Amino acid sequence: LIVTQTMKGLDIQKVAGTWYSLAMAASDISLLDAQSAPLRVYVEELKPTPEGDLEILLQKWENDECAQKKIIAEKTKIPAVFKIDALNENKVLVLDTDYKKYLLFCMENSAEPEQSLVCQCLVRTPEVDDEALEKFDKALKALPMHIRLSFNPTQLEEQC
Amino acid sequence: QTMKGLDIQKVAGTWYSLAMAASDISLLDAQSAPLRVYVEELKPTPEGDLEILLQKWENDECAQKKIIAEKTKIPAVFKIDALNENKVLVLDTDYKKYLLFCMENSAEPEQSLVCQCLVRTPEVDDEALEKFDKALKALPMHIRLSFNPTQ
């Protein structure tokens, strides 16, 4: 909910492209507890707009299917921070990224900093390197995480 | 990484599942997952075998489970009486406060493993969680759950 893990000098234009949710963590297990859990979403693609906003494509397990969801994150006065505008979450924090291999982000509901925090380690390819996971664990150190998930059922998907 | 000198009759009683971890996300996937079980009581028999009482989620109700595990040639290792080849490994315990164990199954195409950090009372514990995580370092775990006490 704290820790200056904020990303400095973030060029939102360079994170365009598809990504796979490699790992995710929450401070309240109820959030990711199941495929049906609310924050159990899989980032499909990040698409920046000319105005500086962020279009996020997500897949959600939904009644046996795979509902495609699109969230528009709006840039704020602070770079690396975007408003969601979802009903459960309201903020998006880019913690770190090399633009080329990994990307770290959390969604928050500023109003309930305590437990609404959800972070994900995103990767460019469905392959896998231990680098992305090292960085991610480093960021969660000072965070009240109570559930942690690591994926290998593959990004190709075994959970749609 | 088993514990040597385990005196099974000592771990008798009520325990609380403080934390769990599994190699497969499906194992603890949802409060209804198959190994998403909460230890309720440990019951050592005079002969040296072990009875485990669990709390699971079946038919919207938290039903009690009862596993029977028999001794092996190795202390701290128990053969579960089930069709699926199952063993229970007690990695470490201080008897008075916490206990760490894993549950295996060699009938799976690959490996299916789950471990829990148990505590004697409804209280979180920094020593317990610390031990637990260093014990998992050499195991391929893909999911970790930590509680604030409940079920």
From Swiss-Prot, chain B:
GO terms for cellular component: extracellular region. Primary component of whey, it binds retinol and is probably involved in the transport of that molecule. Alternate disulfide bonds occur in equal amounts in all variants examined. GO terms for molecular function: identical protein binding; long-chain fatty acid binding; retinol binding. Disulfide bonds join 102-115, 102-117. It is found in: Secreted. This is Beta-lactoglobulin. The gene is LGB. Its main location: secreted. Keywords: Allergen, Disulfide bond, Milk protein, Retinol-binding, Secreted, Signal, Transport. Under physiological conditions beta-lactoglobulin exists as an equilibrium mixture of monomeric and dimeric forms. Interaction with LMBR1L which mediates the endocytosis of LGB has been observed in PubMed:17991420, but not in PubMed:23964685. Belongs to the calycin superfamily. Lipocalin family. The lineage of its organism: Eukaryota, Metazoa, Chordata, Craniata, Vertebrata. The chain holds residues 21 to 171 of 178 of the full protein. Synthesized in mammary gland and secreted in milk.
